[PDB]
């Protein structure tokens, strides 16, 4: 017959490869892990002008998939006793004490329910002083905890507090504690000079190469991580097998898998979105609809706590797209990285087709 590695490659060719021509995407990396075996598929160019092929060393920007590492760092700090999720941010960032935002707890920040934090920091909020003023000028709108509004400043403040609790800057929390503990060796908040030859150009909608570092420093927990396909497969492996790690990072990973509330069929975990498995394709597409991503939604308590579940997260930057998904009880996951954005629905659809067709 046909070996599994070839079967997986054929499924990725059938479902992901056509996206390169359809969306004029220069380069793409797709990885699958099944039963602790990893399958890596590279396509196209990490740099068009340099004719440099995408490969296992290629570094991509993760966009909002960065939040999964921030969530892991918060789970680590919580299980080390450095924070409680019931704490408020002024316990750690003392300049926020006696301000309205100091009524919001860390779990509410991490899961986007403060009631008045928008998708992005304002364009003019650039320096650390402007970030502090932004949070001190914050006033509640909706009742705290009642509405989910997906928000980069909300989880950015969470990450800043996590880092304060660990007495290190956020970049050092990831690069010196969290990445080493997950065994990731080519993941960065700041790509060093000696790795720039491996950093893909991002490509904008005019297929022009772009190298953009966005927003204030305290937005890094929301969207500032870079990684390679092998590292992202290792990160999926850690999520599939937390029992294989030391107690503190194992508990950190498990913390990120705990659903906190629902919006319709979506369970909000820490960083991860979570779903009953098997999930219909429309459930997964709804999680990325304008209604869910861009508008405020009332949250409801979890009713069905799904025994059998799956998790995913999309991410994009101006020049990059990312999607990661895993299904614990099927021992499987998938990572897609591109150096041009393509619609989130296409990433979700292609991964759904691949994962449902792979022989069990």
**Integer Cα distance of 120 and 205 in angstroms:** 21
Indicate if 234 belongs to the active site: no
287: tokens are 């999680």
Say which experimental method was used. Answer: X-ray
DSSP H/E element including 316:
strand 309-317
Q: Let me know: does 41 contact 33? Beta carbons within 8 Å.
A: no
State this model's resolution in angstroms.
1.3
257: tokens are 């898998």
Give the contacts of 129 (CB within 8 A, at least 6 positions apart). Answer: none
- Report the DSSP beta bridge partners of residue 60: 227
- Considering Cα of 21, then 57, then 235, then 5, what sign does the dihedral take? positive
Q: Let me know: does 304 contact 261? Beta carbons within 8 Å.
A: no
Nearest to 326 by CA among 256, 264, 225: 256
**Integer Cα distance of 211 and 355 in angstroms:** 32
Nearest to 60 by CA among 36, 25, 96: 25
Nearest to 12 by CA among 29, 25, 27: 29
**Integer Cα distance of 243 and 305 in angstroms:** 21
270: tokens are 């820490």
Give the contacts of 201 (CB within 8 A, at least 6 positions apart). Answer: 26, 46, 47, 48, 49, 209, 210, 211, 319, 339
> To the nearest 5 percent, what fractions of the chain are helix, strand and coil?
40, 20, 40
The neighbour count for residue 331, using CB atoms within 10 Å, is 15
156: tokens are 């950015």
Residue of 56, 57, 64, 114 with catalytic role: 64
Range list of H helices, the chain: 4-15, 17-23, 66-79, 106-110, 128-136, 152-165, 170-172, 179-181, 220-223, 229-240, 247-256, 281-286, 290-294, 344-357
**Integer Cα distance of 81 and 83 in angstroms:** 6
**Integer Cα distance of 60 and 226 in angstroms:** 5
DSSP H/E element including 263:
strand 261-263
DSSP H/E element including 45:
strand 37-47
200: tokens are 């893909």
Q: Let me know: does 240 contact 98? Beta carbons within 8 Å.
A: no
**Integer Cα distance of 216 and 152 in angstroms:** 11
């Amino acid at each position: 017959n046909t070996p599994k590695d070839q079967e997986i490659k054929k499924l990725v060719d059938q479902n992901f490869k056509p996206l390169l021509e359809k969306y004029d995407v220069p380069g793409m990396a797709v990885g699958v892990i099944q039963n602790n075996k990893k399958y890596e598929m590279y396509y196209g160019l990490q740099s068009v002008q340099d004719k440099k092929a995408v490969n296992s060393s290629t570094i991509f920007e993760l966009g909002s998939v960065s939040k999964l590492f921030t969530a892991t760092a918060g789970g680590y700090a919580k299980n080390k006793g450095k924070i409680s999720f019931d704490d408020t941010p002024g316990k750690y960032w003392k300049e926020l004490k006696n301000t309205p935002i100091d009524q919001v707890n860390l779990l509410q920040l991490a899961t986007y329910t403060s009631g008045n934090l928008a998708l992005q920091f304002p364009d003019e909020v650039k320096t650390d002083q402007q970030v502090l003023t932004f949070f001190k000028d914050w006033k509640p709108k909706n009742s705290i905890g009642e509405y989910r509004q997906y928000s980069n400043p909300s989880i950015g403040l969470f990450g800043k507090v996590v880092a304060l609790s660990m007495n290190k800057p956020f970049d050092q929390v990831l690069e010196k504690t969290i990445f080493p503990a997950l065994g990731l060796k080519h993941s960065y908040v700041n790509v060093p000079k000696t790795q720039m030859q491996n950093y893909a150009f991002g490509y904008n909608q005019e297929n022009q190469p772009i190298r953009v570092n966005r927003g204030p420093l305290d937005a890094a927990p929301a969207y500032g991580v870079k990684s390679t396909l092998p590292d992202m497969l290792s990160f999926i492996h850690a999520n599939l097998n937390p029992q294989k790690y030391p107690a503190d990072i194992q508990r950190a990973i498990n913390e990120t898998h705990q659903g906190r509330y629902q919006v319709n069929t979506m369970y909000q975990a820490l960083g991860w979105e979570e779903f009953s498995y098997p999930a219909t394709l429309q459930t997964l597409l709804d999680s990325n609809s304008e209604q869910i991503v861009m508008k405020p939604n009332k949250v409801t308590a979890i009713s069905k706590e799904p025994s059998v579940k799956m998790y995913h997260k999309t991410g994009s930057t101006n020049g990059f797209g990312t999607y990661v998904v895993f299904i614990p009880k099927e021992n499987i996951g998938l990572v897609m990285l591109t150096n041009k954005r393509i619609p989130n629905e296409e990433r979700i659809k292609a991964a759904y087709a691949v994962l449902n067709a792979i022989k069990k």
